[PDB]
Ligand SMILES: [Cl-]
């Protein structure tokens with residue numbers, strides 16, 4: 001059974017990947033966001049949805065989890081979804097400005113503001129992607145993100161969270177925080193995933209070298225055939 | 234039916250992708266090599282092979298096609314193959330030195346020399362990946378690559394070529410050149426693919442924005458579900 005990583009373990013594994021293993025961020029971020037779009041398309045196939053193209057709002061935060069979201073949005077569009085992005089706080093780095101341009105060239109619209117009421121979100125988007133905070137955030141949720149999470153917590157439509165539900169303690173979870181219907185753990189699940197309450201938990205990010213898996217005792221499941229996700233039941 | 238691109242068209246589309254669209258090379262190279270490993274695993278599944286782990290020799294050339302090969306090798310290992318790489322001429326750029334390190338950390342061995350006889354290649358490797366020359370090469374095949382192609386042309390085991398069979402005119406093919414059993418066209422097929430004589434032609438590189446597909450009249454086939462390849466019949 002797969003290892004659930006502490007924040008310190010997650011950070012160690014990441015340090016190795018981008019340093020000794022010499023993977024680049026945009027490379028693993030590409031594979032991670034592809035896994036996210038893949039898990040979404042598996043859990044909520046366009047046929048299962050009442051809108052042809054199904055609508056999705058992807059909300060991207062100010063760090064790497066936000067980047068995973070941008071890559072996720074672009075693959076969802078290729079997979080037959082109709083994504084909209086809300087990306088209020090963007091790092092001033094070419095990685096992210098390039099990702100945004102890519103989404104714009106995919107004809108994915110960016111919102112200028114978040115709808116202020118859950119009912120409006122419910123009415124416009126069949127699914128909401130939470131790409132707000134990742135496993136490095138240790139907190140004080142400041143604004144614009146506190147009120148965004150407040151709206152998310154009132155939604156009727158499902159939320160899919162990338163890696164960790166935003167606003168959860170990376171190890172401890174958060175009983176009173178958002179409760180995503182889908183979680184995509186990237187690389188290996190974090191300890192907070194033991195508190196996951198939704199229907200779908202997928203592992204994604206099929207790039208972990210066997211040597212790293214062995215060193216950290218990750219005990220990854222076997223991804224089937226050529227798939228980049230695995231459904232954890 | 235899909236458009237088969239001229240060299241000039243292929244180069245235009247590439248210029249757009251990496252310039253106006255602001256995709257990065259390592260990003261599309263990741264997706265391209267993943268599609269290659271995926272097509273290989275579909276056409277030659279490990280179960281269909283007489284060796285548990287199936288052995289594969291991936292021969293990487295001095296440009297981007299060589300890079301696609303390196304990414305291909307690493308995903309093949311994750312897919313359950315036992316790759317070996319021969320990479321005689323390597324650009325002095327971090328893109329490629331990083332890819333090599335990644336393959337080394339995947340425990341993929343690099344050969345110091347090419348076996349000089351087809352029989353030896355046949356005996357050691359169940360499949361040979363031709364990642365030697367891509368659609369930018371306009372020629373004189375110099376050495377070490379001329380004698381490598383001479384050995385390849387004598388093989389009994391199948392060759393899978395990335396994008397274009399190395400040594401073929403990118404538009405005209407080459408009746409007397411290598412005859413791969415699998416071709417993975419990347420982005421859109423090139424005119425040389427009309428001369429393809431093998432059993433398996435896959436399209437890969439599922440990243441083409443609809444606007445670019447429209448502008449160049451690519452008429453891409455519909456990739457099924459979340460797959461990153463499509464079998465062209
Ligand atoms: Cl604040």
Ligand SMILES: [Cl-]
Nearest residue numbers: 374375376377
């Ligand atoms: Cl020479």
